[model samples]
Structure formats: C-alpha cells, structure tokens
Target: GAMGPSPNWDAVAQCESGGNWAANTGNGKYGGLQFKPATWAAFGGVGNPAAASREQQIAVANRVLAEQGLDAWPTCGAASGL
Candidate 1:
C-alpha cells in the first residue's frame, strides 16, 4: 500500500479506481478516486471529473472526507478501515 500518495489515500485509490488519474470505467464513476458525478459535485469538484488532474481528484476526495466523512467511500472505507 505504498508507491506514492500516502498509505490511506493510496488504499482507497487502489480499491476505487486503481489510482488511474484519468480513469473512467463507464460506470458513471471517474478519476483516480472514482468519484461519481453527484458526490464529486457535492464535495466541491467542478466540471468533468475524469478530466480532473490527480491532485484535484485527491483534493476533492479530501474535501469529501472532511464534509461527508469516510462513509462517502463506503466499500473502500470498509476495505481500508475507516
């Protein structure tokens, strides 16, 4: 659970989107942290999520963590231990 991006962020990233900055699995989820459109928007993200840079994705994820707490990541949260 190492290789850049902190252990916790890396864990969720690996579980969610496999850390691909431009990932878009066509599941309506996007980016390195695989944020859904609504959650991204709710968490202070703007415009297209898949097109967002890795840092931006991380920023939004952190924002989500602050506002919504770990429950926002659900399975990833459980997998990585909240």
Candidate 2:
C-alpha cells in the first residue's frame, strides 16, 4: 500500500464548506466537500450529498479525486494544499 497520510480532507472541507458536513446553502453544492448533484451521482453517491454522513461524503470525495482530480474542487482543492 502507498503508506502515508491521506489527503488533507479536513482542510478541504474547511475551505469547501467551512467544515459543515450538512452544508447545502442553495448554491447547487452540497456536503462538506461541496459536491454538485451531477458530480455526486457520477461518483456513486445516492440522494442528497448534504444528507449523507461526513464519512460518506469523504468517501465519495475520494472517488472524485481519483477519477476527476483536484479540478473537481477548482478552489478548495488547491486552497487545501492536499
């Protein structure tokens, strides 16, 4: 395994949604990682991203990072320095 710390998702969350796991502020984004509905659905997420648990959101976010890379975030991904 690639032994090392995971990406700084905590910081990414902070930058994405002020660390609010239930964030859904009507900007077409949801969850701590602020995922769009299409992106969320594309990445194996079901229902509302904000409604999902923090761990669930993080798991989906990892899948997004794996397939789409940091450009998915565009802002927080770089700001988080992960």
Candidate 3:
C-alpha cells in the first residue's frame, strides 16, 4: 500500500479522473491517477484506468505517493470544496 498521510483517495480520484475507470486525459495520462500512458504501463497499468478496478487505481496512486510524496501529486488545493 502506498504510504502517506492517508489522503482522501476518493477526492484524489475525483479530481484526477472524475472516478472514471477509463478516464484518459488524452494527453497520454491514463488510469484513475492519471498516470502518463508510458508511465502507466511502467507501473503495470494496462494503459486504461477504466480497465482497472477502483482498488487497482488506488493502489497505483498510493504507489505514486510513496515514490513522489504527497506534495508531488497535489490533485487539489489546500481546501477541497468536495
């Protein structure tokens, strides 16, 4: 499990991919974490968040958090309206 302050994974997913499993930014980012297509494949994502389960996406996000730190992936600002 990716470690951090235990971010609101729900909010992060919503902000990043609107909770869409196949939510691709079309900019190359894929998965709920919106990982770049290349990056997603590197992380074991099938280049399609929609193809992965919510748990799968969260796992990827957590992995990213562990590697990049929370600050490196601030999906939202100090105050999340949601």
- Highest TM-score: give the candidate number: 2
Error of 3 at 63 (Å): 1.7
Ranking by lDDT: 2, 1, 3
Looking at model 1, report the run of 10 residues with the lowest lDDT sum.
1-10
Q: Find the 10 residues in a row with the least total lDDT in model 3.
A: 73-82
The superposed Cα distance between candidate 1 and the true structure at residue 52, in angstroms, equals 2.8
In order, candidate lDDTs are: 0.61, 0.66, 0.56
**C-alpha RMSD in Å of predicted model 1 compared with the true structure:** 4.9
Taking the tens digit of each residue's C-alpha lDDT, what string does model 2 give over 1-82?
4565455766777787884767656666776766677776675656656666766667766667766667777566733455
Model 3 lDDT tens row, 1-82: 3454544656666776675656644655655555555545555646545566776666655666555555644545212322
Count of clashes in candidate 3: 3
| Candidates, ranked, TM-score | 2, 1, 3
Evaluation by lDDT, superior candidate among 1 and 2: 2
Candidate 2: TM-score?
Answer: 0.63
Q: Which digits, one per residue and each the tens of the lDDT, describe model 1 over residues 1-82?
A: 4554434655666788775656645665776665566777774555555666766656656656776567667577522443
